[PDB]
Amino acid sequence: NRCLKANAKSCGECIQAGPNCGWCTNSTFLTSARCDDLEALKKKGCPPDDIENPRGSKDIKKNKNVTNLKPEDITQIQPQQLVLRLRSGEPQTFTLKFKRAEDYPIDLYYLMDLSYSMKDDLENVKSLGTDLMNEMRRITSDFRIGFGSFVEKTVMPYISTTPAKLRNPCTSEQNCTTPFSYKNVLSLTNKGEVFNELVGKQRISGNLDSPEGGFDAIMQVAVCGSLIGWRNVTRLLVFSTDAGFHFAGDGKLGGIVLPNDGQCHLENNMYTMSHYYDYPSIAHLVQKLSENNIQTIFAVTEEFQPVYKELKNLIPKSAVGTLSANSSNVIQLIIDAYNSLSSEVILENGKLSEGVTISYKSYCKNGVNGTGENGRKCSNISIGDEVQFEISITSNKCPKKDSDSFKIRPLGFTEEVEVILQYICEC
């Protein structure tokens, strides 16, 4: 074994070398041979009152039961805080319960491509505010909607820069407004009528290359916080477009080399830095959408389904729907997407110290049990359903003498479990 082959010179070393090791201190043991298996020691005449064997532990510290109310007074995950003392190489496992709340508020921000092919769509979305509100009455008791528009970076080569085309990027007869990156038209409000009023006043625009600059807008919607109005509720971002998307690296064609900084840069409700920061990368959006608990609904036309479906596989808590040619079906699209998103829970953890590892096992409905990366998720979660996760943590070092802490939480939610780690390195 590796208890003896460690040559433990002290009880200390003996601990860090093997979870199956124990240490004798009697000096009635006929050197490093005092470090042997818990059985190999008893078989060699070591009183259990002498075999020093520190073991890891679990102590739950906060444990409000799942609910059955303001959102913050609603509990969907338990426990909320625990302490794990970790013997090197010995996992400590605990159970997370997740219960889908019966009724939870929804903030939905409708972020719309307003390039010229979306002109007919814009005509339909004119009543979307009130129609969606009416539908949502049967989904939640507390719904708010907002609206933003995007087109493109306002620089060569993505837009034409002749004086005429800057005034009107479209044909002479088409009365398009000047190209713009992103306009935060309407912050989240419970007044659907106001959504109708404002969206009805928006002017369609245009630009030159087919992919659009919506990733610039998504980033702003994710990180602009109170300017958008997000509450700590279900946050839905509907991204509506009939084209593909620019991303990081595309900016170099326009001489834009600074990476997106992922900070808010709205002035007078407009994004002002599209000429200065590159489009975000997918990974950057992943970071910022996740961090801000945004669940994305890609409402995109048939021809770009292939692209957005791959995008959806890279962005956690996202869904894809097929938008009709004039957004006529967008309400049912949004409903279907919300239902899909709400019925799946995905756990993430914060960064662990070196030598520390985490494994998940999920226990879902109809005895569907996930392991590996699938242990982080459950699917087909209906309203009121409970699911559970067995979460195992192991230290294989002596990571610090200082305690660590990290969070486990379901993507899209503020609620989280604080896991405090303590490392047994000494006797």
Partner 1 sequence: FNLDAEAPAVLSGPPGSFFGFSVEFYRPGTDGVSVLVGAPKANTSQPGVLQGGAVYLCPWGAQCTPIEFDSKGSRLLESSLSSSEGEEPVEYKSLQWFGATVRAHGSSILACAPLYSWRTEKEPLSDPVGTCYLSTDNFTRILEYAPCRSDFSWAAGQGYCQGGFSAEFTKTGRVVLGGPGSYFWQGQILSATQEQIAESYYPEYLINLVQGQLQTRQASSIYDDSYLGYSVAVGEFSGDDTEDFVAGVPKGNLTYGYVTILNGSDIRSLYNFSGEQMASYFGYAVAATDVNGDGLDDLLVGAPLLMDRTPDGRPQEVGRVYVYLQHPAGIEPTPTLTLTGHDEFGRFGSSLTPLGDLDQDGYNDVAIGAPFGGETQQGVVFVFPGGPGGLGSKPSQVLQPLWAASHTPDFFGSALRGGRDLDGNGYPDLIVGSFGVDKAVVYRGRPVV
Ligand X SMILES: *[C@@H]1O[C@H](CO)[C@@H](O)[C@H](O)[C@H]1NC(C)=O
Ligand Y SMILES: *[C@@H]1O[C@H](CO)[C@@H](O[C@@H]2O[C@H](CO)[C@@H](O)[C@H](O)[C@H]2NC(C)=O)[C@H](O)[C@H]1NC(C)=O
Does 259 carry a binding-site annotation?
A: no
Angle at 122 between CA 117 and CA 128, to 5 degrees: 145
Angle between helices 128-136 and 330-342 (to 10 degrees): 40
Shortest-Cβ-distance residue relative to ligand X: 328
Is the link from the previous residue into 157 a cis peptide, with omega within 30 of 0? yes
What, of ligand X, partner 1, Ca ion, none, does residue 121 touch, CB below 5 to 8 Å by kind?
A: Ca ion
Does 366 carry a binding-site annotation?
A: no
Binder of Mg ion out of 115, 181, 295, 296 (CB under 5 A): 115
Q: How far is the CB of 272 from ligand X (least distance, A)?
A: 35
Q: How far is the CB of 226 from ligand Y (least distance, A)?
A: 7
Query: In the complex, which residues of this chain contact ligand Y (CB under 6 A)?
Result: 231-232, 363, 367, 369, 414
CA-nearest of 382, 401, 402 to 101 is 382
Residue 60 CB coordination number (10 Å): 13
The nearer residue to ligand Y, 120 or 418, going by C-beta atoms, is 418
Residue 297: both structure tokens together: 């609904």
The answer to whether 366 contacts ligand X (rule: CB under 6 A) is yes
**List of residues 6+ apart from 281 with CB closer than 8 A:** 247, 248, 249, 259, 260
Binder of Ca ion out of 36, 107, 113, 152 (CB under 5 A): 152
Q: How far is the CB of 152 from Mg ion (least distance, A)?
A: 8
Torsion over CA: 59, 62, 67, 71 (sign): negative
Report the alpha-carbon distance of residue 300 to residue 309 in Å, rounded. Answer: 10
Q: How far is the CB of 384 from partner 1 (least distance, A)?
A: 28
Report the alpha-carbon distance of residue 218 to residue 110 in Å, rounded. Answer: 11
Within residues 103-132, the interface with Ca ion by CB under 5 A covers 120-121
The nearer residue to ligand Y, 175 or 371, going by C-beta atoms, is 371
Cβ pair 381, 363 in contact under 8 A: no
Report the alpha-carbon distance of residue 182 to residue 397 in Å, rounded. Answer: 49
The window from 38-46, 150-158, 182-190, 253-261 that contacts Ca ion (CB under 5 A) reads 150-158
Residue 58 CB coordination number (10 Å): 15
Q: How far is the CB of 409 from partner 1 (least distance, A)?
A: 12
Does 291 carry a binding-site annotation?
A: no
The answer to whether 326 contacts ligand X (rule: CB under 6 A) is yes
The nearer residue to partner 1, 330 or 356, going by C-beta atoms, is 356
Start-to-end CA distance of the chain, whole Å, equals: 21
CA distances from 54 to 61, 185, 387 (A): 21, 61, 33
Binder of Mg ion out of 51, 128, 176, 243 (CB under 5 A): 243
Report the alpha-carbon distance of residue 209 to residue 420 in Å, rounded. Answer: 51
Cβ pair 228, 260 in contact under 8 A: no
What, of partner 1, Ca ion, Mg ion, none, does residue 335 touch, CB below 5 to 8 Å by kind?
A: none
**H/E stretch holding 369:** strand 369-370
What, of Mg ion, ligand Y, Ca ion, none, does residue 216 touch, CB below 5 to 8 Å by kind?
A: none
Does 27 carry a binding-site annotation?
A: no
Does 211 carry a binding-site annotation?
A: yes
Q: 61: left (phi > 0), else alpha (psi -120 to 50), else beta?
A: alpha
The window from 243-251, 318-326, 332-340, 361-369 that contacts Mg ion (CB under 5 A) reads 243-251
Report the alpha-carbon distance of residue 71 to residue 293 in Å, rounded. Answer: 15
Does 325 carry a binding-site annotation?
A: yes
Torsion over CA: 363, 366, 371, 373 (sign): negative
The nearer residue to ligand X, 39 or 303, going by C-beta atoms, is 303
**List of residues 6+ apart from 413 with CB closer than 8 A:** 76, 77, 293
SS3 130: helix
Report the alpha-carbon distance of residue 336 to residue 332 in Å, rounded. Answer: 6
What, of ligand Y, Ca ion, Mg ion, none, does residue 29 touch, CB below 5 to 8 Å by kind?
A: none
Binder of Ca ion out of 36, 107, 113, 212 (CB under 5 A): 212
Q: How far is the CB of 219 from partner 1 (least distance, A)?
A: 14
Binding mask 238-267 for ligand X (x = CB under 6 A): ------------------------------
The answer to whether 44 contacts ligand X (rule: CB under 6 A) is no
The answer to whether 130 contacts ligand X (rule: CB under 6 A) is no
Annotation: binding site for Mg(2+)? 115, 117, 212
- Footprint on this chain of ligand X (rule: CB under 6 A): 124, 326, 328, 365-366, 380
Annotation: binding site for Ca(2+)? 117, 120-121, 152, 207, 209, 211-212, 325
- Footprint on this chain of Mg ion (rule: CB under 5 A): 115, 243
- Footprint on this chain of Ca ion (rule: CB under 5 A): 120-121, 152, 207, 209, 212
